[PDB]
Design a protein around this ligand. Structure first.
Ligand SMILES: Nc1nc2c(ncn2[C@@H]2O[C@H](COP(=O)(O)O)[C@@H](O)[C@H]2O)c(=O)[nH]1
Ligand SMILES: Nc1nc2c(ncn2[C@@H]2O[C@H](COP(=O)(O)O)[C@@H](O)[C@H]2O)c(=O)[nH]1
Ligand SMILES: CCCCCCCCCCCCCC(=O)O
Ligand SMILES: CCCCCCCCCCCCCC(=O)O
Ligand SMILES: *C(=O)CCCCCCCCCCCCC
Ligand SMILES: *C(=O)CCCCCCCCCCCCC
Ligand SMILES: [Ca+2]
Ligand SMILES: [Ca+2]
Lengths: 143, 68, 283, 267, 267, 283, 136, 68
């Protein structure tokens, strides 16, 4: 993701991440989801009764299409390593149904929602490093 | 013709406040007639994320209905 | 004395039960999500001192990146005269690291810092004697006559800017103004070098489309100034570019797949950036 | 205003946030909001423990299901939370506990459904036992279901013999299992989730008791009851079903008398 | 206000007027509005021609159709207008042309449809050619479709042999035919027509280039792309279809270098 | 002009016969002994000018200590390509001198001065000819792609900081900020990189325990930029670290026994620091 | 001595029981279930430093003929403000008999040593489901 | 932007007093924008041995009974 691609040019990062979702079902479909960020340290939230015990928000589908759930920068170190590392654990963002999407007569019974990620104004990244995301065949020459 | 400026707070440095001592001053004297020859332009932390995160015509404020 | 701008601090907040819902929005507007900790959970007061001091374009592009590697050979053998020099076309597409970064923006404007690193070695077992080498980098702008042989009149450089390196000394380097003939450097170009009129090929254009068809910065004619010795010697010159005093406009997504050619072009061979994940519910 | 709808509303406590785009205002029980014990009203002299965010947040109970047959549901505060995260720990490690809560009942359908849930918050919700052989005959285990809570029925069949069927509430819907016509259950703080109108119910409630602080492990101050005043209905099937979810959040919680943890009888 | 909805909106230019009762605001590219060349920024010294109303109006392109199979569409400014009334004439009679536009993408359905179109306005929209035998191999004819514009696909099959299939864009949807994940196409001025929310998209865009004025007949500043981020869907058939119409309106147009008219290669 | 603080001077004192006994105390309190000459014997007046000016942490750590020695070989023989470069893991545990000193404190915070010394020589009797060598030290932070071969795209360093040395010139050196992602550098760490939960090995952790399991500063990818010559040449690069602008917290006893690995770990082979003394009464 | 920093979480975190020091060092290079535990070598603090200098740490000495208690108040210490407790133990309490217990009567005297700890100024961030580490 | 300071009393130098002549002054001009690049921080002879030799709560004075 744009956020990711950028973080990947640096070594450390700090800040809060903004997860915003846009439900694209039919106007006629209702429902209440539950987005959640559980900071590291315990059994990863497999069920709702566990995700609900951490940072969460009960999103009610309605006229307001989108809904954001923020991942409050909660960390032990002040900066997290960009590369994957256990010391710099991030946490678990999951989702569940608070109730269940409900549609009526003649209404598409299955649809989707788009998930976006962005950084909050308290976000900063440091230590310029090269990015792994691109490769290049050792250049020819002429010898 | 030298111009002194503030350094970038280091390890055992001024509380982030960058307002402690002249021991954080670096001198600069451009030597060439062509600007192009100069060091990196001074760090500019200005920014307007909005031209990208909110280039919407009518302005909407968080606490309100995005779609009124 | 002044204080660099820090990233938003966190002001302490608490509960809520209003008709003010910062959580909900409508990204259809085209506006990104805005919420922050305070809007969603109970926060404490936090004084942030940290700064995006390193994401400043000038810092982000503040490195001497290698753009190309030229080769040339000072040999005394039959067909080793054309080898006695080399002509490189000025550009940053020869590699991919720097290119990708600049490629983050549609347009850019800057001054340039050229730095050169020479590395000579012996090819075959002709591991004999050769005096010290003195190289010459001559910048030949579009329109200027180009060298025929490693030593035709062109290497006079009465007007072309030329460096003279004495192998073993500090990596020669120099600065270049923003020379673009435009108000800015164009990184992409959805157009053709000229307009194909009514009576022409039904394919006209396929030859002159793309930024590459309009951009031109001239070439670097490198060479060793010494004459040919008994034993043949091989040198490799590496060009380094650091755009300084920069500023860019219009952000675009990063190059996600391998680069083919100088244009956008992709290769069916590698166009799967991402990676299969067990399940949508696999942490 | 910038269109500050009476329908749209957000609520936040601890690290939890509810939202709802179709609510019908919210009510504050008896007009009073949760408060703490004031030095002039105090009783226990030990310095209280006030959990704040760690326990004063939004805990979500296992949803139930609304069927054309559904007769009603019930729960008990603090009971139906005794197992909810940190709140519980504090609740059980202390002899005395005090708290108020924000009740948020959710239940979305579609503009083509019918139905109306009466969400009532009754203080001191005592129900009759199911056995005319004894009186006030209810086991602790049965009285305190927890996250599950009970359900109402529309029939009364006491087990004067089988003493294991007597030790439980006689959840008679048309009488609140109390011996009072449910038709007047409105003299209690309440809201009505009428599907064609709203999909949420928000009722903030303050501690209520003849004492400042009490012993939670023995006493349930409030009782949450939901009765379908209007039967669920859908044009399609004759067996429609919609989920009803209950999210509770304690507030201004404080405890006195800390000791070893309490672990009640269980099965 | 008297109920000045963020949804309802009218737009007028020349003798043309758009209206929409379900839009989601409107966005102004990079926050700047169309302007003319200021005496301090000028380049061509001849007195410019500023058409005003005659050309700065709402031209409507032939609608396209959204199918469950539809992969996306694209167009190019000023290209996709080179034939639009008076604007075109001026565009072609002059060497240099400058302009900004107001893009209005329309697409109504019904409260029972699903779908979401991502309308992006990308500056310098260069796509890869369809032939791995050559590079930047695209014919003028193919690069400049006009009112018709192109379409995106979800497959990449270069014709290294057939040189008449190479001379065209490789409109690979999941990569914008540029070699960049469409998932990040949002770093461009854009709006999303999510059927359950809106039915219009309005994006005002200012001239963008490394120059003040350029040669339109050679260069397309902007590129309009529409990708179904959410597939069209209707409860009824499994082959639903809805029209998508694109109405563009140039603004602050000025041209320099007048001569005989330009007539490019065609078939 | 100012006067550096001197160590306590001795004020003249004499006899005594009071109930004031500076001699006696009770170290059980945890307080060290405090008495000084004056308290015990008759002293004369002495003006002390001497200063602990050299025990200042900045002076004590003010030296460019060698931390490691890397080797690499530019050879033209079959399996001598992987030898054409080397990757070193950034740390001070490779040696013991500097390590022990820093190890005097639990935490520390400082800027770093890197200094490099190159020394090339001939291995076998391949004592022939080879042009002058140009090396490259590339700092590859955690997460950045690492070199596959002595010459794959990675050595572009469009973002990674790289030095280019021309053997024979002054020992290249450079400075590094306090980069720790903590508020200080942690020298020890009584913890595990992550928390092993209920259903796991009854041994989980043995792999990720110790400061070493959480610390990571990236690596130094060194190499010679020249191509392979007839005769093989061997180079040894030595890394020197001098922590400057330093400050440390929580003192701990010095490492008394030989070092095993990067952790505290001892070896039964050598754990007898002290030395037998004839008798308790042997001067 | 077959591995380094080889200690299991289970063994590193005994709890109320804590460990004990010994005066011998016998590594189990083979038996990998005896390696995954601390080598509590008393005369070296099991750290490789003479215990004789363990006094450069906050401390007190319970000398029976003088006192019978030891009170040491300690503040949070770390290279960070707050950390993750379930992974990291900031402090370590160690008690070594600098003077051997002794009683005129038996040649096998015994006296109880009790340890009472009290946390202070405790604060936590990042609330979620409860953590339950590996156990036996 | 230069900052002059006192040198470290040498061989045939000012009586330890370091207060004799400008012949004991050294000049310093930071050349880089990053503090990290600077020389060793100025000698600081401050010290509080007590946080280690006497971190006792109730303070005791030499002349008194350590255990009262
Ligand atoms: N959340 C909250 N609302 C209160 C309290 N006391 C009164 N209110 C009511 O809630 C409104 C909003 O305040 P609160 O900070 O969201 C107040 O204007 C008042 O009507 C209280 O202690 N907490
Ligand atoms: N040591 C000492 N004590 C004296 C002398 N004359 C009187 N004293 C007594 O000793 C006390 C303490 O004085 P000294 O210096 O320890 C005096 O206050 C006085 O009572 C003397 O010459 N020497
Ligand atoms: C003696 C050395 C002369 C080198 C002349 C180089 C000319 C600079 C052209 C600008 C190249 C970078 C701009 C770009 O492609 O974005
Ligand atoms: C071009 C050379 C780059 C060298 C980068 C070195 C990174 C510094 C990490 C700090 C290492 C010492 C800190 C410590 O281990 O206590
Ligand atoms: C302003 O420049 C006054 C200070 C001058 C100090 C001398 C700096 C050294 C000389 C600068 C380069 C001159 C090149 C001809
Ligand atoms: C304060 O700095 C005024 C004195 C300047 C004297 C000139 C010192 C020599 C130049 C310093 C380095 C400048 C690098 C651009
Ligand atoms: Ca701030
Ligand atoms: Ca003195």
């Amino acid at each position: 993701t744009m956020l990711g691609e950028i973080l990947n040019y640096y070594t450390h990062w700090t800040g809060s991440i903004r997860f915003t979702f846009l439900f694209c079902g039919s106007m006629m479909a209702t429902g209440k989801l539950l987005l959640s960020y559980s900071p590291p340290g315990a059994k990863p939230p497999t069920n709702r009764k566990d995700a609900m015990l951490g940072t969460h928000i009960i999103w009610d589908l309605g006229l307001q299409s989108s809904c954001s759930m923020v991942a409050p920068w909660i960390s032990n170190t002040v900066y997290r390593r960009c590369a994957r590392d256990d010391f710099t654990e991030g946490g678990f963002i999951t989702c569940f149904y608070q109730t269940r999407i409900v549609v009526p007569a003649s209404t598409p019974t299955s649809m989707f929602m788009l998930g976006f990620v962005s950084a909050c104004p308290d976000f900063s990244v440091r230590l310029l490093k090269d990015t792994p995301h691109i490769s290049q065949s050792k250049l020819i020459g002429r010898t | 013709g030298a111009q002194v400026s503030t350094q970038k707070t280091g390890a055992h440095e001024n509380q982030n406040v960058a307002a402690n001592g002249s021991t954080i001053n670096y001198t600069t004297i451009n030597y060439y007639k062509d600007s192009a020859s100069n060091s990196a332009t001074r760090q500019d932390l200005s920014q307007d994320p909005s031209k990208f995160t909110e280039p919407v015509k009518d302005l909407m404020l968080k606490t309100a209905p995005a779609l009124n | 004395v002044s204080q660099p701008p820090s990233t938003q601090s966190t002001e302490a907040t608490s509960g809520v039960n209003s008709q003010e819902v910062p959580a909900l929005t409508a990204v259809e507007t085209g506006a990104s999500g805005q919420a922050i900790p305070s809007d969603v959970v109970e926060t404490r007061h936090v004084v942030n001192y940290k700064t995006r001091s390193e994401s400043c374009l000038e810092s982000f592009f503040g490195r001497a990146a290698c753009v190309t590697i030229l080769s040339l050979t000072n040999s005394s053998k039959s067909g080793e005269e054309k080898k006695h020099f080399n002509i490189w076309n000025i550009t940053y597409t020869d590699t991919v690291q720097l290119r990708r970064k600049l490629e983050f923006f549609t347009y850019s404007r800057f001054d340039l810092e050229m730095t050169f690193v020479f590395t000579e070695n012996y090819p075959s077992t002709a591991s004999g004697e050769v005096r010290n080498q003195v190289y010459q980098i001559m910048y030949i702008p579009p329109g200027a006559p180009r060298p025929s042989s490693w030593d035709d009149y062109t290497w006079q450089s009465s007007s072309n800017p030329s460096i003279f390196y004495m192998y073993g000394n500090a990596p020669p380097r120099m600065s270049i103004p923003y020379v673009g003939i435009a108000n800015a450097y164009s990184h992409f170009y959805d157009g053709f070098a000229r307009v194909p009129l009514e009576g022409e090929n039904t394919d006209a254009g396929d030859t002159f489309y793309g930024l590459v068809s309009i951009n031109d910065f001239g070439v670097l004619a490198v060479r060793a100034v010494n004459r040919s010795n008994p034993h043949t010697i091989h040198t490799s010159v590496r060009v380094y570019m650091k755009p300084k005093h920069i500023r860019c406009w219009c952000p675009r997504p990063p190059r996600a797949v391998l680069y083919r050619g100088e244009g956008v072009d992709m290769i069916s061979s590698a166009i799967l950036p991402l990676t299969k994940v067990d399940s949508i519910t696999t942490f | 205003a910038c269109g500050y709808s009476d329908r749209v509303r957000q609520i936040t406590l601890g690290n939890s946030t509810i939202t709802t785009q179709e609510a019908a205002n919210a009510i504050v029980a008896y007009g009073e909001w949760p408060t703490y014990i004031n030095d002039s009203e105090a009783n226990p002299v030990d310095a209280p423990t006030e959990p704040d965010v760690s326990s004063n947040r939004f805990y979500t109970l296992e949803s139930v299901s609304w069927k054309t047959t559904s007769r009603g549901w019930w729960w008990k505060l603090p009971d139906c939370l005794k197992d909810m995260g940190m709140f519980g720990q504090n609740m059980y490690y202390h002899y005395l506990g005090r708290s108020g809560y924000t009740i948020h009942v959710q239940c979305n359908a579609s503009k083509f459904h019918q139905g109306a849930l009466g969400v009532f918050l009754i203080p001191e919700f005592v129900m009759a036992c199911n056995t005319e052989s004894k009186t006030s005959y209810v086991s602790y285990i049965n009285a305190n279901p927890g996250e599950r809570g009970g359900e109402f029925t529309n029939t009364y069949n006491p087990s004067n013999t089988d003493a294991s069927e007597g030790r439980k509430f006689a959840a008679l819907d048309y009488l609140l299992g109390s011996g009072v016509l449910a038709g007047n259950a409105f003299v209690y703080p309440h809201q009505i989730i009428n599907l064609r109108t709203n999909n949420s119910a928000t009722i903030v409630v303050p501690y209520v008791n003849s004492l400042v602080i009490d012993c939670m492990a023995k006493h349930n101050n409030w009782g949450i009851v939901i009765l379908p005043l209007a039967p669920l209905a859908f044009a399609a099937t004759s067996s429609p079903q919609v989920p009803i979810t209950v999210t509770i959040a304690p507030m201004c919680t404080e405890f006195n008398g800390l000791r070893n943890i309490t672990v009640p009888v269980h099965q």
